[PDB]
């Protein structure tokens, strides 16, 4: 068994990790108080759930994460929360002020005077595993903790964890959720120097959520509750092969593998359904081929673009519920005699299927509905540069003309540091139609 | 924990200041000696970003009383909330300024500011976080004019990397106690361009007509115009005082308001603004028609006359936030050509479920607008009327300065003129 | 009030619809980079699609399909009518082609020369471009390879019909051209008013050379044919009186002979790529103009020749199809506070 | 259209199918990076401060 240490950053990774730990602990029937009823082994054990969580003598079983956030007030709730039992304070980090929004305030202002802590923190649960495997690190773009101290905590693990893999879950800017008018800037700076040390990275686009949230859970103003509880449910989708029994996507290594030929081109499009208002008087429940089917439709997907017109690299099936390989495949032939599902010609056409029985799980009081059967597509497409045509494109009307720079440059940030990392999104997206248009 | 030290200078500055703390004191549910009263915990959540709290779960206004002279502040304590304020951050001297920008910046407020300073140094010492600081002034005089600068600069020397806010009255004929307040508000706005991060911009002459016109009030008191000041105050200040979805934090805002240093000063407005057929209700549609108006903004500017570089409203109330979305969105897609189109979803919104006292909901409106240019063009035409003619200078040459001084301030707003005209086009 | 921004100032068409567009007074234009807007009339090559639908509260419309360049492009229809099982290989209105790379660069160079093998063994074949007017007729293969090597981008080679149907008097060559209008519910309307563009010059199956009486272009009869409007005012003869000659001379309507392969032959290619272009679960919704180019032979058989996706209109015709664009395609989408001129072709989504 | 590895276990199972076949810096140079931010963000107010006592 190998252990998996996460790492919330910011207030958006803090609050989505709250959705994935409380969503964990319901999958695996681990209690708040860390006690875990069915686990046999009292204190110890190399079980698939112990990937994410280490245990007591007491039989208490304790989140393998660090949650870190410049300003307090967030990280806070967790420490009086439900779950306030699970971390021990070590694990809970939290500064004084905040970087205001400002990438460069993250990164180097205050970023600099507590790296080392942080690392300090991340290095006792190190010491805690016996063949740790790497880190997922969530944090959003927009932020400036989420952006500019991300950037510096990936490249110091690059520094001490070497060998180990980083896996990445983002937050795409979305201007239905967000009231700062620089994120564009925060993206694209913390997109450039987090891009050599991240092996594969999953974007959510808040405006993916929110829209989600509102035509199938009918909620008219979403909160940040039903956004991240819908966000944990694709996390767990996407984690649960590392905390299960199975064959693929077993380490994290295998995510790179299976999704990642191209290292710069490190950016999954993931794509989920069914997603089901438990507010309805009572679904008719789908079968595969219809929630095989929902994974080529624009609704469902964590970005929304247009993959039939871009170019696959790589495709991964995860299906939770009552499927056999006998209906995945019927569903396929079914798909590619209808879609137009167009591969690289340096890539196989074919694709990996990974099924976990237990079906996914729901929240108490939550917003989704439970469901016999469902599905996340991992899909690394051209078409999600979209995205980053959509972020570049605003970047460049604000940096015309030096709009907010000075807040970047009066935290010590050169403003040439700018243009170097606008150049390389353009480079990002020379590679994305160098290998998706003919 | 992130607190605001708050200081007040000079007559307008006390008196606004004080009906400042008269209104989001009841908003907090503190009465006038200190006790708390209100109903609802989210009265205490954010209470110690404004206020201390002292022994016996009294709650104490971090305020800093500052004149030089003593009538203003002694009726402040005389006032309603009067006893509320600490003993100890009454500093006050005796000769007074004179309406005069030099007595205050130079000679009499150079005597008096270092005791100033040790006051405010103090309430810092005992802040855990110290978010920054909020100025309430006016221009015109002398003692905030002049001496209230001179404190910014001070407190910019000492505490670098704080965010300083202000609320400055400006000057207009209309609302004239000298005819020296174009001299003094044009030394002041240089000061304001170097020293402040945001400067909501009070006109007196839009507080004037909002009270003869749109409020029928037959030539107010300084008092009636001062209440549009206290609701201005309390609605910038409500995303900082109740918990709101937003962060809220002087600096974020300062990120998201001011994409260019020396273009901070804001045009503050609110709805509603009715006379006394007030019963009615106010509809979503009405608050944000009525909020984007020219005739409910305090810079007494025309913003059809130049274009939004940001915009921020505060909504307050329980009231649809998706017929708010819907509204705002209806607003900016109804009038975008006076918005920039080089800064992406420059205008964001944020809703408090608190309203004020005795409304069911309102709002709030904050401009970082280059119309703003027409207030600092009024005040440079009056002051280049008077200085053409050196008419009224011997009492500022009599406390030291020179013309010399006269012709930078002059040159330095026309360059911020011209910097507000080419951010127009 | 609706906001629209303009992207191709060399639109004779839209030109028209924004001018209407603006009478309506209720229809406000913005800076071409402005963000916010309702409706785009978009740029011909490289429209950033992927900026579309992003901006909270609008309903943003487009003028053209992502992804029809497909059925637009000379190579590409080829490549798509060969591939397509909707259309298979056997599709027989549209003529034999091949799709010939240049050798200086899949490509059909020996299956040409095999089917071209088998006629020799009427053999008259016409190479043509998406970069030309640059076209060359002739008979022997030879002529038509050399031709294609002499440039540098991908060129088509297609049998050339031998026995066009002539109109009398004159013994001249002809084609039609129909426009066809696609709205974001994907119903395909047809123009009720189409266009003969027609040759002043007398048709001559004897010489290849001379590309003036084959070639029925507007630009080419009016700058190398010198009858240029003789007949018809402009080589433009409209179906009023394109339909009575049919019924004088060979006794049938245009409705029968001729209109309904095109109204198939527009179904078919349209509701092909349907599944590849459709927004209908897409975050905005797309709309697109289409000039589709027939032939006729005189076995009253039409043929498919080409589908340009920036047609230009009539001259007569500007203002009738014009409202109609803002009547089903703007307004159906943005209504404001007949008999119509469309023909509405049924079909199976 | 072919299945291969097919992995079964109590939990679920796994397997893949080919529809056709196919055709740093140093904590040296880090904390260099950090520091010369610091020594910018000094410069700038040692002029506000040097302006200041102007
Ligand atoms: N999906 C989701 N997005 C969030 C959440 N919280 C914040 N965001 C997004 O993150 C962006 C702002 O970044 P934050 O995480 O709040 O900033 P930060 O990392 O705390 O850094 P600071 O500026 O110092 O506060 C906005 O665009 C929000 O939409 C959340 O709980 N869920
Ligand atoms: N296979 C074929 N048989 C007979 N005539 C043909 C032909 N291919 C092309 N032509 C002639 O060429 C003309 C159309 O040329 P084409 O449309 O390919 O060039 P083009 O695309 O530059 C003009 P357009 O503006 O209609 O797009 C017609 O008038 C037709 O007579
Ligand atoms: N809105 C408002 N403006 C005031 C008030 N008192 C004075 N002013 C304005 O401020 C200017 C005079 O400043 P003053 O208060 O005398 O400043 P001081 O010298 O510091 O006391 C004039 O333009 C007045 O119109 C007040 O109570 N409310
Ligand atoms: C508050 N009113 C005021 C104050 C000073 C001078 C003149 C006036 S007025 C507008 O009544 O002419
Ligand atoms: C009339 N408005 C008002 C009055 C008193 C206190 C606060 C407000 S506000 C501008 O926040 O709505
Ligand atoms: C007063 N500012 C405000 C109000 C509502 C929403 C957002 C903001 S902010 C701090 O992002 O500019
Ligand atoms: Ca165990
Ligand atoms: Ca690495
Ligand atoms: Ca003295
Ligand atoms: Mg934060
Ligand atoms: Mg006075
Ligand atoms: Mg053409």
Known sequence: ?438 | ?425 | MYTFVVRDENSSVYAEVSRLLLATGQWKRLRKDNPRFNLMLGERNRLPFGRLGHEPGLVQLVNYYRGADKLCRKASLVKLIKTSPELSESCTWFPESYVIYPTNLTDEREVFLAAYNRRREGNVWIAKSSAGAGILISSEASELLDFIDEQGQVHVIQKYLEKPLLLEPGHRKFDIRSWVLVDHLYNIYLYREGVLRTSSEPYNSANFQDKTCHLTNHCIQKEYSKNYGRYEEGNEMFFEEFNQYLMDALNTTLENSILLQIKHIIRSCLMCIEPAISTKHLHYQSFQLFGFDFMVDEELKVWLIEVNGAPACAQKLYAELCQGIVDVAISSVFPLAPTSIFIKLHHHH | ?54
């Not at chain 2, 110290?130 to 001070?154: A, C, D, E, R």
């Open chain 2, 1 to 425: 924990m992130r607190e605001i030290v708050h200081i007040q200078a000079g007559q307008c500055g006390n008196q606004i200041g004080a009906k400042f703390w008269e209104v989001i004191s009841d908003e907090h549910g503190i009465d006038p000696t200190g006790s708390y009263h209100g109903d609802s915990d989210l009265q205490l959540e954010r209470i110690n970003v404004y206020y201390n709290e002292a022994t016996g779960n009294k709650y104490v206004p971090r305020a800093i009383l500052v004149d030089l002279e003593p009538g203003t502040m002694d009726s402040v304590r005389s006032g309603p909330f009067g006893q509320i304020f600490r003993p100890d951050n009454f500093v006050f001297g005796q000769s007074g300024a004179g309406n005069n920008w030099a007595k205050g910046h130079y000679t009499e407020g150079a005597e008096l500011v270092d005791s100033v300073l040790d006051v405010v140094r103090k309430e810092s010492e005992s802040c855990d976080c110290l978010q920054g600081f909020q100025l309430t002034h006016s221009l015109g005089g002398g003692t905030g004019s002049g001496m209230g600068t001179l404190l910014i600069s001070k407190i910019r020397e000492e505490y670098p990397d704080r965010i300083m806010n202000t609320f400055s009255v400006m000057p207009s004929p209309k609302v004239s106690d000298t005819v020296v307040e174009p001299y003094n508000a044009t030394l002041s706005v240089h000061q304001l361009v170097e020293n402040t991060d945001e400067t909501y911009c009070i006109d007196n002459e839009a507080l004037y007509d909002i009270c003869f016109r749109t409020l029928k009030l037959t030539t107010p008191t300084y008092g009636d115009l001062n209440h549009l000041v206290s609701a201005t105050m309390s609605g910038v200040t409500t995303c900082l005082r109740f918990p709101g979805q937003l962060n809220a934090d002087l600096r974020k805002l300062a990120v998201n308001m001011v994409p260019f240093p020396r273009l901070h000063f804001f045009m503050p407005g609110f709805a509603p603004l009715t006379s006394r057929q007030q019963y009615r209700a106010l509809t979503v549609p009405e608050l944000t028609q009525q909020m984007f108006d020219s005739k409910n903004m305090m810079a007494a500017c025309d913003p059809r006359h130049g274009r939004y570089l940001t915009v921020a409203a505060i909504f307050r109330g329980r009231m649809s936030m998706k017929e708010v979305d819907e509204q705002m969105l209806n607003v900016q897609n109804k009038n975008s050509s006076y918005f920039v189109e080089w800064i992406p979803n420059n205008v964001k919104t944020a809703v408090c479920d608190i309203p004020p006292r005795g409304l069911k909901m309102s709002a709030t409106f904050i401009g970082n607008s280059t119309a703003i240019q027409e207030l600092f063009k009024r005040i440079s035409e009056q002051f280049t009327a008077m200085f053409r003619r050196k008419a009224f200078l011997h009492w500022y040459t009599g406390e030291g300065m020179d013309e010399m001084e006269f012709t930078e301030a002059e040159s330095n707003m026309n360059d911020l003129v011209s910097e507000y005209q080419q951010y127009q086009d």
């Open chain 1, 1 to 438: 068994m190998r252990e998996c240490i996460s790492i919330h950053v910011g207030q958006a990774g803090v609050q989505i990790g709250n959705a994935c730990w409380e969503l964990y602990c319901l999958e695996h029937g681990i209690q708040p108080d860390g006690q875990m009823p069915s686990d046999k082994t009292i204190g110890g054990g190399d079980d698939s759930f112990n990937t994410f969580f280490s245990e007591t003598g007491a039989g208490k079983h304790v989140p393998r994460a660090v949650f870190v956030d410049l300003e307090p007030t967030v990280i806070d709730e967790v420490r009086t929360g439900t779950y306030r039992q699970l971390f021990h304070p070590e694990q809970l980090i939290t500064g004084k002020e905040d970087a205001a929004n400002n990438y460069a305030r993250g990164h180097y202002t205050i970023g600099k005077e507590i790296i080392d802590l942080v690392l300090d923190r991340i290095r006792k649960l190190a010491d805690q595993c016996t063949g740790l495997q790497g880190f997922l690190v969530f944090h959003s773009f927009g932020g400036g903790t989420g952006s500019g101290f991300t950037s510096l905590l990936m490249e110091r693990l690059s520094v001490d964890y070497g060998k180990k893999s980083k896996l990445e879950f983002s937050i795409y800017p979305a201007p239905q959720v967000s009231t700062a008018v620089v994120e564009p800037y925060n993206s694209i700076l913390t997109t450039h120097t987090t891009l050599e040390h991240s092996d594969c990275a999953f974007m959510v686009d808040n405006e993916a959520i929110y829209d989600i949230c509102r035509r199938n859970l009918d909620i008219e103003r979403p909160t940040y509750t039903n956004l991240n509880r819908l966000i944990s449910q694709i996390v767990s989708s996407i984690t649960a092969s590392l905390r299960f029994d199975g064959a693929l996507n077993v380490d994290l290594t295998e995510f790179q593998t299976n999704l990642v030929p191209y290292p710069r081109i490190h950016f999954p499009l993931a794509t989920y359904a069914p997603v089901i208002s438990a507010e309805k008087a009572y679904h008719e429940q789908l079968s595969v081929a219809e929630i095989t089917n929902a994974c080529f439709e624009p609704a469902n997907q964590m970005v929304k673009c247009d993959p039939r017109h871009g170019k696959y690299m790589a495709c991964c099936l995860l299906y939770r519920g009552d499927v056999v390989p006998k209906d995945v495949n019927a569903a396929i032939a079914t798909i590619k005699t209808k879609r137009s599902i167009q591969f690289v010609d340096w890539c196989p056409t074919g694709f990996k299927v990974g099924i976990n029985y237990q079906p996914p799980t729901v929240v108490p009081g939550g917003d989704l509905a439970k469901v016999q059967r469902a599905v996340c597509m991992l899909s690394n497409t051209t078409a999600i540069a979209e995205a980053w045509a959509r972020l570049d494109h605003k970047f460049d009307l604000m940096y015309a003309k030096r709009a907010f720079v000075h807040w970047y440059v009066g935290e010590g940030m050169e403003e040439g540091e700018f243009s170097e990392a606008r150049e390389d999104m353009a480079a990002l997206e020379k590679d994305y139609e160098e290998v998706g248009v003919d």
């Open chain 4, 1 to 54: 259209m072919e299945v291969i590895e097919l992995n079964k276990c109590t939990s679920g199972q796994s397997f893949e199918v080919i529809l056709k076949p196919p055709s740093d810096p140093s904590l040296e140079e880090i904390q260099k990076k950090l520091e010369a931010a610091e020594e910018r963000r000094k410069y700038q107010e040692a002029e506000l401060l040097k302006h200041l006592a102007e």
